[PDB]
Amino acid sequence: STGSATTTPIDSLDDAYITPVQIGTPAQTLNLDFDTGSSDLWVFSSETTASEVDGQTIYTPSKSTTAKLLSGATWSISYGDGSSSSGDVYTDTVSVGGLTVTGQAVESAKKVSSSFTEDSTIDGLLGLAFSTLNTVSPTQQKTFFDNAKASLDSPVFTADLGYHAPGTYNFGFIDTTAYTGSITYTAVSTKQGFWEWTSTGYAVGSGTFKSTSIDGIADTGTTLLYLPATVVSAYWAQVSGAKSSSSVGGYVFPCSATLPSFTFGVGSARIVIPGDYIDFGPISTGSSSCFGGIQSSAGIGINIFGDVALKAAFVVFNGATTPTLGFASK
Ligand SMILES: [Xe]
C-alpha cells in the first residue's frame, strides 16, 4: 500500500504545515501538523476544555462507530516551544492520503496549552518520530507510520515541504519526479527517539564550505533552523545590521536586507537554502526589524533541522530495520 497527501502552510510565513487526516467512521477530517520530532497523534476533541477551543475542528469519538476507548490510558506531552497537551486515548481508523490504519491510537485532548488554543489552523499533531517517545501511559502506543509500515510497498515516508506553497507527504514510495539529481542517504541514530543525523558542514552565501560534523534532528514540527552559535554568528555576520536580540529572543535583521543563502552538507552532497527562506518577517506588525530563520541552538541542547532547512530538500525518512535519512535537491 501507499498514501499521498498534500501539506499546506498555515500562514504566509510557513510557520507550520497542515495535512488533512481522516479519523473514524464516518470520517472526521482534521488538519494535523505532521511532526517528525514527536511521536503522539493527538487531536482537539469533544472532550477538550471548551474555553481552550477557539476555531479548531474537533474529533468526537462518540460519533465514530469504530472508536473504542483505550481503557485507563492517558497521555501528556510538552514540546521544545514550551507548549503542552494531555488527555485520554481512543483507538480508531485513521487514513492519510488513501493509506488506512485500523486500531490507531488517537489521543484526545482534555487540555491544551494556550499556544494551541490561539492557533485556529491546527487541529492537532501526527507524530512521525520513533514510537519510543510516545507518551501514552501505562501502555506505550505506536505512531501511524509504525502501524502502517508492514503494509507499505516500502517502509519509508517522504517530506516535500513547499516554500510559501503546498507540498506533499508520501507513504510507502519514493516519487522520483519530485527531486533533482540523486538522493544522498546518511546514517541515523535512534537513541534519543528522533531522526538524528550528522551534517558534514556548511557554507554562507557564496563562501567556502566549512567541513565540520553537526549532529541534529530532522524535525518537520519545528519552524526554524537551530544550529551552534558559531555557525549562526557566521551566517548573520554577512547581513548588515543583523544582531542577536535578547529582548526579541534571537537574531533580527533589517527588513530591507537581501539575505544570503545557507548551504548544509549531507555526506558529499549539498543542500542550498535560498536567502528568502530565512526571512520570517517583522518582529511585530509594522516593524522594520525582521526575525531570522536561522537561530542559535545554544539554549536548546540539540541542533534542529526544522522546516527552514527541510523545505529546501526532498527528504526521505527510511524506516528500514536500520533507519536512515535521504536528502535530494529539488
Ligand atoms: Xe549545518
UniProtKB/Swiss-Prot annotation:
It catalyses: Hydrolysis of proteins with specificity similar to that of pepsin A, prefers hydrophobic residues at P1 and P1', but does not cleave 14-Ala-|-Leu-15 in the B chain of insulin or Z-Glu-Tyr. Clots milk. Disulfide bonds join C255-C290. Keywords: Aspartyl protease, Disulfide bond, Hydrolase, Protease, Signal, Zymogen. GO terms for biological process: proteolysis. It comes from the Eukaryota. The active site is at D35, S199. Residues 17-328 form the Peptidase A1 domain. GO terms for molecular function: aspartic-type endopeptidase activity. Its EC number is 3.4.23.22. Belongs to the peptidase A1 family. This is Endothiapepsin. The lineage of its organism: Eukaryota, Fungi, Dikarya, Ascomycota, Pezizomycotina. The gene is EAPA. The chain holds residues 90 to 419 of 419 of the full protein.
